[PDB]
Each structure stands twice: as structure tokens, then as C-alpha cells.
A paper describes a structure:
Recent studies identified cyclic GMP-AMP synthase (cGAS) as a cytosolic DNA PRR, and its product, cyclic GMP-AMP (cGAMP), binds to STING as a second messenger, resulting in the activation of the STING-dependent IRF3 pathway. In the presence of dsDNA, cGAS produces cGAMP from GTP and ATP, which activates STING as a second messenger. The structure of cGAS adopts the typical nucleotidyl transferase fold, consisting of the N-terminal α/β core and the C-terminal helix bundle. An HCCC type zinc finger (ZnF) exists between the N-terminal core and the C-terminal bundle.
To address the mechanism of immune activation by cGAS, we expressed, purified, and crystallized human cGAS (residues 161–522), including the active site and the double-stranded DNA (dsDNA) binding region. The crystals diffracted to 1.95 Å resolution and belonged to the orthorhombic space group P2 12 12, with unit-cell dimensions a = 123.5, b = 48.31, and c = 59.57 Å. The catalytic Glu225, Asp227, and Asp319 residues are located on the centrally-twisted β sheets. Despite our high resolution structure, electron densities were not observed for the regions between β1 and β2, and between α2 and β7 near the catalytic pocket, indicating their structural flexibility. A zinc ion is coordinated by the side chains of His390, Cys396, Cys397 and Cys404, and forms a protruding loop structure. In our structure, Leu174 is oriented toward the solvent, as seen in the mouse and porcine apo structures, and the catalytic pocket is partially disordered. These observations suggested that a similar structural change would occur in human cGAS upon DNA binding for catalytic activation. The concave DNA binding cleft of human cGAS is composed of a positively charged cluster of lysine and arginine residues, mainly from α1, α4, and α5. In contrast, the ZnF in the human structure forms a partial helix with Lys400 (equivalent to Ser388 and Asp377 in the mouse and porcine proteins, respectively), which is exposed towards the solvent, suggesting an additional interaction between the ZnF of human cGAS and dsDNA. Our structure of the human cGAS apo form resembles those of the mouse (69% sequence identity, r.m.s. deviation = 1.40 Å for 315 Cα atoms) and porcine (74% sequence identity, r.m.s. deviation = 1.11 Å for 312 Cα atoms) apo proteins.
Numbering used by the authors: 162 to 217, 223 to 254, 261 to 288, 306 to 362, 371 to 425, 428 to 521
The structure:
Amino acid sequence: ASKLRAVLEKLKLSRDDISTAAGMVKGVVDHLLLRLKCDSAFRGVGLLNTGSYYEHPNEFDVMFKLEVPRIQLEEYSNTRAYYFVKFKPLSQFLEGEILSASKMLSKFRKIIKEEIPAVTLLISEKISVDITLALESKSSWPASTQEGLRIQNWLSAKVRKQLRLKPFYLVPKQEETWRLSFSHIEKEILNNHGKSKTCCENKEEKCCRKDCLKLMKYLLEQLKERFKKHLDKFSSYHVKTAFFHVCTQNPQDSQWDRKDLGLCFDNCVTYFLQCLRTEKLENYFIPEFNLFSSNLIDKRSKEFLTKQIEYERNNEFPVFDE
Ligand SMILES: [Zn+2]
């Protein structure tokens, strides 16, 4: 549809500005990586490479991963996503048997501080980088994910098995808990997203999946930008999660034809609206973890965002107007 394509054209205008800043961040990040490598605790550290930039302007997100030897997890309450970690030289942060996140974060923060979720939010001039520490575990994924990643009918059972052989990550968050992270898998599915292995590799198989995700993120950004903080709790992660569920529901590449961009976008919006109304948005990897629970976002805010998105959809997205 013309309006949506005009919006996608407008977003392209900002590409080089994002590009150039990325190389400035990358220079600083490359610089911290080497100094973190000197410290005993962080000697194995490396760059995970994930998030918006890696997937397809002043804000950037970077994850530092650290290989931790044979890990053992303990689920904080019945949270599904939060854990204490223990083992089957990081013993300096051991609270007896349990790895202290705030001990690890304090030194991690101090080293970067010396050099100059999120751990560090740091600055080169008008560049905000969030830097996150992630423990890497090459073990089987925890049981809370056993019913997650429901890609079998879309990306295939074989791909699901291959993805679950990859490591998983833990990011520091009733204190001292770590949360599961699969940002590496999120990037892999967005960049290898078709039922056809050649989806978006030639002119006959251009789908509109990525453009739909971009449009959904831009929709939420624009609605937030209009308010000085009713929508503070909503993030691009909610939009991305909802988008993954919509790919599951529409597994065929022929359901994402570029010429059907308007209909595909409507699908994404209508699903996100359903999530708002039912107050349920399951983490794509951890189904019992409800991103839209009342513990996380009050009923009123969810109700409020429902009204605006409903208004936008019923009037052809005036927020996207010239
Ligand atoms: Zn494609």
C-alpha cells in the first residue's frame, strides 16, 4: 500500500546516519573488548552481535558474552525466565554456591568506567550505547523453553533442532537472578526467515516480513513520541515478539508477498491488538512468560495502547500521514 511504502522510503533516508554511528560504536566497543580481555574474570569475553542493527539512530545495543564452564540453573520461584546460577576464575563473585550478578556487574562496570540489562549505558557524543553482559551456556536449554520456539510448521522441525543445539545466554535481570536471552536466535530467524531457503535471495521470492517488523516498530515509536509517559512500558521487543508469533501463524512465504504489504501489516497489527486486549504476549521462547502480565504492565496502560492502535487501524494509520 502507498502510505506504508512511503513510510518505508522515509526510514531509508536515515540509513547512512545509522551506519556511520555504528562504526563509531564498533570502534569504541572493539576498544573495550581488548581491555576487558586483560581482566581475569572477563578473559574469555567476546561480542555476541545481535539486536536491531545486526538484524535490519543515536541509541545502540551491544551484548558481551562470556563462556562459563558447566553451569547449573535454579529457577527463581515459578518465573520460567529468572534463575540463580551455580556450577557443577569467577569464584570471586560466588555467594557460597550462587553466582552474584551484582558482584559481577560491579567489576564489569568498574572496568569500562576505567576505560572511557543494561549494564553500562555509555556515551560517545550523541551516541547512546547500552552494553549488556551475557553468560554463555553451551548446555541443553532449560525446560521452561521445551514448548517454545514453535517454528516447526514455518522454518521446519530440523531447523528447530539445529537452533536448540546452539548455546543460550543469561543476562543479569530477587536480586542475584539472571534472565534467559536468545537474541542470537532472534537474529538468526529474522535473517533466515522464509519457508523457502532462498526467500529474499532473488526477485521471485521477495517477501515483506522484515518490512512488516520495521513498520510495527515505527508505529509504536511514533505513538510513544506523541506522548510526554502512558506508553513508557512498551518496547520494540514486544512488537518483535508479536511479530514472531504472526510468522508462526502465517508460515508460507506466499502469505508475505510484497504486493500484499498492506494486508500483511494488518495481520501484524491485528495480532498485537489481540495481545493487548487479552493481556497476553508469550515470550517466543518461554511460553509461560507473559510479557503483558499485570505484574509487568498495568491494565490501564494496556487498555490505553489498545485504544490508540485500534483508532490507527480503523483510520488507515493517520500517525503515518504526510
Ligand atoms: Zn523473505
